[PDB]
Amino acid sequence: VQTLRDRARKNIQEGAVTEGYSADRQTVLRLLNEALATELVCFLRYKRHYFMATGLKASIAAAEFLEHANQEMQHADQLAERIMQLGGEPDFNPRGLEERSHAEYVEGKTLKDMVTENLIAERIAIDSYREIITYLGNDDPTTRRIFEEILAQEEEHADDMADILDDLA
Amino acid sequence: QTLRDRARKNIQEGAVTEGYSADRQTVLRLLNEALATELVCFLRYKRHYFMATGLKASIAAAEFLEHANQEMQHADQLAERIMQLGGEPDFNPRGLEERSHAEYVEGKTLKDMVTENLIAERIAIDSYREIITYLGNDDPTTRRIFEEILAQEEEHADDMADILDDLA
Amino acid sequence: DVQTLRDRARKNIQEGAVTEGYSADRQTVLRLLNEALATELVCFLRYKRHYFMATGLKASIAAAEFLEHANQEMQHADQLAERIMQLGGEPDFNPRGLEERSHAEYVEGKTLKDMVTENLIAERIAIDSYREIITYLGNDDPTTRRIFEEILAQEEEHADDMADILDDLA
Amino acid sequence: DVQTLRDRARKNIQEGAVTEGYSADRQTVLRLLNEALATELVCFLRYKRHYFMATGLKASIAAAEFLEHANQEMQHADQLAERIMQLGGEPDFNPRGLEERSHAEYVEGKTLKDMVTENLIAERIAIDSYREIITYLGNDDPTTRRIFEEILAQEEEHADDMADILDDLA
Amino acid sequence: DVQTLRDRARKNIQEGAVTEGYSADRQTVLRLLNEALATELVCFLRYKRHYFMATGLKASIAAAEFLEHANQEMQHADQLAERIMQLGGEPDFNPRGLEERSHAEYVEGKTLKDMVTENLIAERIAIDSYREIITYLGNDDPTTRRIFEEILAQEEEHADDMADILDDLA
Amino acid sequence: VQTLRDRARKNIQEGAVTEGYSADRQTVLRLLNEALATELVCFLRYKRHYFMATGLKASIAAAEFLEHANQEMQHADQLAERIMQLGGEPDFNPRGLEERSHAEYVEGKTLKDMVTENLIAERIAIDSYREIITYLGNDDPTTRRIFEEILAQEEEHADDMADILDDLA
Amino acid sequence: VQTLRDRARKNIQEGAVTEGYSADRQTVLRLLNEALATELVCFLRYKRHYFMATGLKASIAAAEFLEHANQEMQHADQLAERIMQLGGEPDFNPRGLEERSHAEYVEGKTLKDMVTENLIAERIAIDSYREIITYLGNDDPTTRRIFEEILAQEEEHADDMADILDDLA
Amino acid sequence: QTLRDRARKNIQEGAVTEGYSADRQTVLRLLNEALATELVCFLRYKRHYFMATGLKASIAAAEFLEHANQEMQHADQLAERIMQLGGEPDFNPRGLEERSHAEYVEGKTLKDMVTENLIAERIAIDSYREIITYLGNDDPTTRRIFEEILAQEEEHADDMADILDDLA
Amino acid sequence: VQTLRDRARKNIQEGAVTEGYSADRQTVLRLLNEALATELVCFLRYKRHYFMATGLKASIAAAEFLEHANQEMQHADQLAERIMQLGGEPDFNPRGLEERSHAEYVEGKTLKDMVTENLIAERIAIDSYREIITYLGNDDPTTRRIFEEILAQEEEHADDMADILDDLA
Amino acid sequence: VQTLRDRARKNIQEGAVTEGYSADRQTVLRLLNEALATELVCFLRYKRHYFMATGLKASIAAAEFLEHANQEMQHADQLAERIMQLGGEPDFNPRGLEERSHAEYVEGKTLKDMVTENLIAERIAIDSYREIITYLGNDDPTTRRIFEEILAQEEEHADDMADILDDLA
Amino acid sequence: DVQTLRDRARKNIQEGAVTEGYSADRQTVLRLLNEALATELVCFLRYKRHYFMATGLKASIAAAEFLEHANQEMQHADQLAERIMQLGGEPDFNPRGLEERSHAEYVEGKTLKDMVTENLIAERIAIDSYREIITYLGNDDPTTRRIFEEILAQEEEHADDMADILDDLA
Amino acid sequence: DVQTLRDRARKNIQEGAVTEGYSADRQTVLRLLNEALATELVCFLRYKRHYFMATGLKASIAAAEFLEHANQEMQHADQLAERIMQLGGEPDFNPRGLEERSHAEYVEGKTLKDMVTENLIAERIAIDSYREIITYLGNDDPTTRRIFEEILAQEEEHADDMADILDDLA
Ligand SMILES: [Fe+2]
Ligand SMILES: [Fe+2]
Ligand SMILES: [Fe+2]
Ligand SMILES: [Fe+2]
Ligand SMILES: [Fe+2]
Ligand SMILES: [Fe+2]
Ligand SMILES: [Fe+2]
Ligand SMILES: [Fe+2]
Ligand SMILES: [Fe+2]
Ligand SMILES: [Fe+2]
Ligand SMILES: [Fe+2]
Ligand SMILES: [Fe+2]
Ligand SMILES: [Fe+2]
Ligand SMILES: [Fe+2]
Ligand SMILES: [Fe+2]
Ligand SMILES: [Fe+2]
Ligand SMILES: [Fe+2]
């Protein structure tokens, strides 16, 4: 009626966040920024491994590392965009990046080191994003779908790294 | 051969099988209302697109056109689903606004246009959230349409608010 | 805090995508994925048959739909097989017993109305079969659920497509 | 002789494309453009309705034409709306009273022959309307005339397309 | 007003693009289109002949032009044939009597200067021929007029191209 | 050695036609020109049918007709180019085109007429080109391959047209 | 049809200009070269404004400036090509370029200066080309269509510049 | 007009004219056996593609997929020829292997997979050489299909042998 | 003869670094890693500003911000690759990134803040890379050319940001 | 350090021109505008020759003429953009264009005239830009690289024109 | 018989494409392939030399043909080298003795007519060499035969191209 | 000022890109360009040999680099040859004495490590050779110097690529 229009007019500057938004906006924003930090850390680690993984066999892994690195940055972009829509600020500050994150930057010494560290990070991300998807439930479909999409990519990343690690003894 | 006999019965219903657990007639009503809403928002954005002239306004005018054509994609997604679920998609311009959750509003200033669009996006968001809830797990294919459309409307609302915040 | 998340991930690391938080029945999900895989392969072969045999002016319009659907069935086959690998299984492409593993049948058909009906029946079998899998999965495995949800939507489109044709044949 | 051309351009400069030499009846040309815009919007909506409803083997062939035509009608709408702006008017996309502003009607039709005939009628109404407008414009407004000359040619093609279909139905 | 436009469109609906307002001599416009169609087909064959026979360094430059023109002539042929159908005629592609229906001749030529000159003659025959048709049409048939206006401009470009070559051939 | 070069020097203007060209060059040239005329006739017939085959079912045929028309012209170009290589002249004269040809231009009144006339022409070309391929044998691989390629297309055209004709009545 | 052929043979070197060309070839060439000069001047003005229109709002104008500049050069090419067809010489001499044209090169100091000067040139061009289109009448369809097509672009340019100027003050 | 009467007789037979000197029935049998071989080889390679994981094995897995899709191109090429010659292409998975000249073999190691593919390629090479001989000059269009497929199978055999030489 | 080959064969594993490499490789490597840290910091700042610069005018700046961000990452890749070729390790560690860098991550509160911080960072890099180009001289053309190319891009970035800043006040 | 930052803040609006800019900005700007005049003049000459060079043989030269014309315009844009970065104004005024230039607009009567006049202009530019490259030295790498790149293009143009002229007589 | 086909394939499996059914003289076919490979490389170097040296308006036309042909020669070289590997040989790219292994010569030429003739001579040498190789192969090796047949047809085109140029040179 | 620049350009006009201001030793630069051209052609031939012979899973990875490098070498060859023409020389593509003109050798290699090492040696020979030429050129010839600076940078990348491979080979 004229109430639908009045409901939309109230707090109009809140944009995507309407009166019917039933999630905890503050908490979803916290989770998005933690994921953002995790993605940025994983981007830097993978790029490091990409340049360092030289040699015939190792170059195959280096290709995966770079492919993954840029996919992590796409995840960062998806998350940063949602942070803006939900009224937050995406934190790209390198200071304290690792502490905000669920991941660590680990140089590694050998190819086995690099492959394992990426595999651990992918598995940390998988379980962490599964839990967020549960927390969101039906309160925020748009954010849930972002994590659902990122999750499937992280599961592919973990499968990719495990397939390599199995040949590395 | 029991699976085959279920599919063999009422074969002409096509996508709608013995396992379709939603209230098909109601889903069809909701789909047509959404279709009317998308067509109205398409016409509004096209109006604003042509009228938003000037340096700043041309920036909004680009968004207006981008959004207009996205609204029509949603209309197509909804009309296609109406056909699959055994209904008829209503493109009749008569009573279009009354079928709709949105209004066609010309606006006089850019702030008028931007606000009217923002109001429409926020109305659609809450409507599609409710439909998504009503569907539940009874119709994944239709639910996913509204979830995909919903996400776009949330982006449109963010886009329009980002503009409105600087206009005054 | 950081070392508990990390210690959960280090345990059974070779399991890859399957983490400690994976709450589905990995063994059963794998069985369902391979049944769907067999179904997609069977439907791919039927549609390719119908594509080549559906000659004539009107039938060539159906023949196009048949080929489009065939290649979509193979995309579904690849999608399911990739998930089978991620969950630690082996995707079964063996043509022996392919039909018995499947939810659908290869049926040559004699007339175009036969071909359209057999395809329409298969689509409707897949729709209800995959709806049940989506229900079985619940919230335990979003990634697999999303595969079936996407395939389901395509089968509903295929069923509508075949039904739209069948209504004009008699 | 240089500062008179320049002074002619300075007078009423905000009028833009409409120069001192514009010899047409701007107010009337604007009315004709908005009537055409309403007609294109109605024809767009009719064709989209027919596109979705024309299912079956033969009908899918018409449905392709229906969609092709629908989107061409929207291009005509855009061309007309852009010219309305250049000539200092406002393009009216309001769905209220759309049909009364228009030379065409939204007609659902029940059968394919209904849909094809209704489209054919609309195309032929547009052809004679735009012929008259082109005559009314004459040499007073080449730019607007060329828009209608371009749209007319497309509408003649639409009419040929629909008649070709109708000849096999009836 | 609403129902007289519609009654006018409904009458003789099968005539398609040709509405009650079509003021040209449909029978004669069709005769002119088929003559032009024959000319384009003849000119296509001449240019292709010259394309294959014009070998050598210098000649290959002309041969490229011959081929470009050959295919532009065929585009004009299709363009005319499509309008013939819209106006209710039949486009005559019969090679029998093709040359006699035409305004041009197939002339093999022995030298490059022969080939260039014969093409230049045909271009100049078409230019004046299509100028006369454009005048005959006047405002009675904008859509057909624009076809000849567009073809004419291409033919004037063809004549310029051939003349530029002939000037070096002495 | 120095004879290989001396064989190439002799009659150098004959170009592709070397001392080893063992076929009956004048006869091959006649066959190429007869085929060239056949393709031009088939091009004109199909283009006629393309424009005249209007209506719902018939428009499906019209698409095949146009597709075929342009393939016939590719064959024409292929043959005319080979005529040049073998020292002849490609004859595009519309006068007597039909008499030089193995096929006829036939307008047809019904769609069944058009489809049948095309089907008859395709089957004529098939047998003509089969015989030419046999006649050439190994004496002229380059020309043989042109006919082998054209033949394969004509067999497809015949299959296409017969498939249509079977449901027309 | 032996008179048509002899008509074409007479004065064959004149090319596109046939015995039936009813316009004043000499004057049309004069009008085309004036138009060519206008297009070249407007090209130079717009390129100047493009480089000088820096800033947030102004960069929006700068895009239109560059878009228009290259559209002006396309018009210059159309006119030059037609000059050749009608037997003239296209004059690209920068010396006296401004005196030959209907428009001026004006640097402008502010953005409002630049926009106003472009709008003035567009409206001068619009009325000049309207007159040429009338002068040509039915004597030269091909040249008329060139000016008709250019005219329509100038009306778009005038609308584009007016829409900007209305917001500047 | 005698050529025309020759073409009119048995017109519905399409591509198969009076001059068709091959044994149409036998050529059709061979095409369908080849079609079965291509389908089996498609399924084997697809299995190997998904199962060949690891650093080295992924290199083989790429070849496996490339070949898999080339096999399906051959399948289509053969099926279309079956239609032109008036037969029916048999895609039924029942008895597919018995109709085929090749086997589906899962393999346990990468060397097993590579070896099984190499065996299948060498079986096809010799099968298609014999068919090319049988056809002779009786059916150029069919012969050329086998000649094209043959060259691809020879490429496949070289690719697989090149892998196998380094595995042990 | 064999002196060219024996010279190349000595210390072969050093790869791109031949006997003729006359630069101070360890120092060049230090400069390369400092620049890499600068590029990553500038990447993160620009991405922050890109997401935060909302509104009609600011969205124009946001586009420049994103364009620049990705060019900064291209520079990072270019430097990291040269680090590898010259026998070092590229440091992507986010800990202490800002201290290894010549630039700072600064969120900024206003658009003028963001633009000014970016302009300051661009001008720091310009002078820094000019000095490196001088330090390199003719001893290492390949590395010199990398900084020359980056410098030219940074000079464009400084002009871009300065052009925005004049309209901001 | 914070002096590095303060150095960037001093005269911040000067953008690409930093405190370390050691060239004579005023003179580099004068040289850039002269070259801009040269490129515009050479653009106009080549366009004239392009339209006027008709005939079989001449059409080959006409193609080179147009290719070069558009390459000259690219140089023009490249120089004009650098003029902006260094704080000047690019002068596109057609008035006095030729006097500001190092080249002349020359219509030429024969094809040999056109080729010769173009060849002369190319060789004037080659020596002119070599001197500018020397004057710049190490003071302005970014500008030096622009002239170095343009120079290479002009040397290619000279070789192209000489190759034509050698066969013309 | 399913295990004899398999046993034939298993015997000498490392020979790859070379099966028990390979009826040609593998050693001799490899010799001929390497001779052709040398011929193609020499012809590549000749054409590249001619491409750079053929300056002037008329000559620039020839230079384009020279470059196109040069790169087509390199495709032939690759095509032959790939077949050499498949048949179990080693492709010899050694510049030492390249000319002695080849059927053609590297000839700089002084005039354009020199360059064209030398290329024309080389094309005609290859034509007769490859016709003989095609005959020698007969039905023993279809895959290799088809390589020479495809290369041959290109060489026949190259010869026509050079002769067409030479005829106008004097 | 105007007519002196013009007179300087007019003197020795046929020398083209080489103006009075060319301060390098043109004869010597031409010698160095031709030596480099020989090196690039030899390196092209070596890498092509290695590309075809490096079979196997790991080696196929090297084979890709080998082919990528081979074709980059040919780009360098063309870049150098074009500059030879501009400076008034003739690029020598003669395979006779090619190796003696070159700074590198064609080496077949027996193992993959052999192939990788020979390429690595060649890259390092080229790297120091082109650094010296860049120094010899100084500021006398920017256009040629930039060619060598660009080629050098590619060779440093090639050397790094080959070294990266060699470390894992043993
Ligand atoms: Fe991620
Ligand atoms: Fe990941
Ligand atoms: Fe929407
Ligand atoms: Fe929306
Ligand atoms: Fe499926
Ligand atoms: Fe319309
Ligand atoms: Fe219409
Ligand atoms: Fe024409
Ligand atoms: Fe044909
Ligand atoms: Fe055919
Ligand atoms: Fe303009
Ligand atoms: Fe196969
Ligand atoms: Fe195979
Ligand atoms: Fe920067
Ligand atoms: Fe230049
Ligand atoms: Fe050749
Ligand atoms: Fe190189």
Distance J20 CA to ligand 1 centre (A): 42
Radius of gyration of chain F (CA): 19
Radius of gyration of chain E (CA): 19
Cβ atoms L66, L119 nearer than 8 A: yes
Of the CA atoms within 13 Å of residue B61, those in its CB half-sphere come to 14
Which residues have CB atoms below 5 A from the ion given as ligand 14?
Answer: I 122, 154, 157
Gap from D34 CA to chain E (nearest CA, Å): 17
Query: What whole-number distance in Å separates Cα of residue K133 and Cα of residue C8?
Result: 68
Whether K1 is covered by a domain: the verdict is: no
Q: Is D25 exposed, middle or buried (0-12, 13-18, 19+ CB in 10 A)?
A: middle
Experimental method: X-ray
CB within 8 Å: C163 and B12:
yes
Nearest by CB to D14, from G130, G155, G162: name it: G162
Query: What whole-number distance in Å separates Cα of residue L50 and Cα of residue L70?
Result: 10
Query: What whole-number distance in Å separates Cα of residue K142 and Cα of residue K132?
Result: 15
Whether J6 is covered by a domain: the verdict is: no
- Alpha-helical runs (H) found in chain G: 2-9, 25-52, 56-85, 97-100, 111-136, 141-168
Query: What whole-number distance in Å separates Cα of residue I66 and Cα of residue I59?
Result: 10
Ligand nearest to the CA of F121: 10
Cα distances (Å, whole numbers) of residue D70 to B156, D42, D74, D75, H159? 26, 10, 7, 9, 52
DSSP H or E run through C63: helix C57-86
Query: What whole-number distance in Å separates Cα of residue H27 and Cα of residue D137?
Result: 70
Q: Do chains J and K touch (3 or more CB pairs under 8 A)?
A: yes
CA dihedral defined by D141, D143, D144, D149, rounded to 10 degrees?
110
Query: What whole-number distance in Å separates Cα of residue B79 and Cα of residue B91?
Result: 9
Query: What whole-number distance in Å separates Cα of residue L89 and Cα of residue L26?
Result: 9
> In a mutagenesis test of the E interface, which of G6, G7, G10, G12 is the best target, namely the one with the most E β-carbons within 10 Å?
G12
Whether H150 is covered by a domain: the verdict is: yes
Nearest by CB to E142, from D120, D134, D163: name it: D134
Whether J114 is covered by a domain: the verdict is: yes
Kindly list the residues from chain K whose CB atom is less than 8 angstroms away from the CB atom of residue L41: 45, 95
Cβ atoms K86, K17 nearer than 8 A: yes
Report angle CA F111, F114, F117 to the nearest 5 degrees: 145
Whether B121 is covered by a domain: the verdict is: yes
Cβ atoms J114, J49 nearer than 8 A: yes
Gap from A90 CA to chain I (nearest CA, Å): 7
Which tokens hold the place of K115? 């360059």
Query: What whole-number distance in Å separates Cα of residue D38 and Cα of residue D58?
Result: 31
Q: Is E45 exposed, middle or buried (0-12, 13-18, 19+ CB in 10 A)?
A: buried
Look up the CATH number of the domain holding residue F146: 1.20.1260.10
Cα distances (Å, whole numbers) of residue L95 to A49, K95, L84? 44, 6, 18
Give the range of the structural domain holding residue C77, as residue numbers without chain letter.
23-169
Residue G149, C-beta contacts closer than 8 angstroms, at least 6 positions apart: G78
CB within 8 Å: E95 and F81:
no
Query: What whole-number distance in Å separates Cα of residue C96 and Cα of residue H96?
Result: 8
Ligand nearest to the CA of F68: 10
Resolution value in angstroms: 3.0
Secondary structure letter of residue D34 according to DSSP: H
Q: Which residue has the tokens 């990719």?
A: A160
Cβ atoms A25, A14 nearer than 8 A: no
Cβ atoms B125, A18 nearer than 8 A: yes
Residue L155, C-beta contacts closer than 8 angstroms, at least 6 positions apart: I16, L123, L126, L127, L130
Q: Is J64 annotated as a binding residue?
A: yes
Secondary structure letter of residue C102 according to DSSP: S
Secondary structure letter of residue J94 according to DSSP: S
> In a mutagenesis test of the B interface, which of D51, D52, D90 is the best target, namely the one with the most B β-carbons within 10 Å?
D52
Distance B149 CA to ligand 3 centre (A): 6
Secondary structure letter of residue A84 according to DSSP: H
Radius of gyration of chain J (CA): 19
Query: What whole-number distance in Å separates Cα of residue L110 and Cα of residue J40?
Result: 59
Gap from H85 CA to chain F (nearest CA, Å): 9
| Interaxial angle between packed helices E2-10 and D112-137, expressed in degrees from 0 to 180 and rounded to the nearest 10 | 110
Cα distances (Å, whole numbers) of residue J85 to D94, D103, I159? 49, 57, 6
CB within 8 Å: C153 and B137:
no
Which tokens hold the place of I43? 């990447």
CB within 8 Å: I84 and A47:
no
Query: What whole-number distance in Å separates Cα of residue B163 and Cα of residue I57?
Result: 9
Radius of gyration of chain B (CA): 18
Which tokens hold the place of I42? 């500038």
Q: Do chains D and C touch (3 or more CB pairs under 8 A)?
A: yes
Whether I134 is covered by a domain: the verdict is: yes
Cα distances (Å, whole numbers) of residue K27 to B81, K103, K144? 67, 19, 13
Q: Is B154 exposed, middle or buried (0-12, 13-18, 19+ CB in 10 A)?
A: buried
**How many other C-beta atoms are found inside a 10 Å radius of the C-beta of residue A129?**
27
Which tokens hold the place of H140? 């150029």
Query: What whole-number distance in Å separates Cα of residue J126 and Cα of residue J133?
Result: 11
Query: What whole-number distance in Å separates Cα of residue H73 and Cα of residue E122?
Result: 49
**How many other C-beta atoms are found inside a 10 Å radius of the C-beta of residue I14?**
17
Which tokens hold the place of A39? 């993605």
Secondary structure letter of residue F12 according to DSSP: G
**How many other C-beta atoms are found inside a 10 Å radius of the C-beta of residue A109?**
8
Whether J53 is covered by a domain: the verdict is: yes
In three-state secondary structure terms, L109 is coil
Chain D residues in contact with chain B using a Cβ-Cβ cutoff of 8 Å: 41-42, 45-46, 48-49, 52-53, 55, 81-82, 84-85, 90-96, 98-99, 106, 108
Handedness of CA H155, H159, H162, H167 (dihedral sign): negative
Cβ atoms I128, I75 nearer than 8 A: no
Whether A5 is covered by a domain: the verdict is: no
- Alpha-helical runs (H) found in I23-139: 25-52, 56-85, 97-100, 111-136
* Residue-wise DSSP of B132-157: HHHHTTS-HHHHHHHHHHHHHHHHHH
Number of domains present in the structure of chain D:
1
* Residue-wise DSSP of H126-167: HHHHHHHHHHTTS-HHHHHHHHHHHHHHHHHHHHHHHHHHHH
Contacting subunits of L (3+ beta carbon pairs below 8 A): A, H, I, J, K
Q: Is A152 exposed, middle or buried (0-12, 13-18, 19+ CB in 10 A)?
A: buried
Handedness of CA I118, I119, I123, I124 (dihedral sign): negative
Which tokens hold the place of D49? 């309705």
Kindly list the residues from chain I whose CB atom is less than 8 angstroms away from the CB atom of residue A107: 93
Query: What whole-number distance in Å separates Cα of residue D39 and Cα of residue D46?
Result: 11
Cβ atoms A84, I53 nearer than 8 A: no
Query: What whole-number distance in Å separates Cα of residue E105 and Cα of residue K98?
Result: 56
Q: Is L15 annotated as a binding residue?
A: no
Amino acid identity at J167 = D
Query: What whole-number distance in Å separates Cα of residue K103 and Cα of residue K120?
Result: 13
DSSP H or E run through A81: helix A56-85
Query: What whole-number distance in Å separates Cα of residue C149 and Cα of residue C131?
Result: 8
Gap from A60 CA to chain L (nearest CA, Å): 9
Which tokens hold the place of E122? 């045909």
Gap from J162 CA to chain L (nearest CA, Å): 5
Query: What whole-number distance in Å separates Cα of residue J27 and Cα of residue J15?
Result: 18
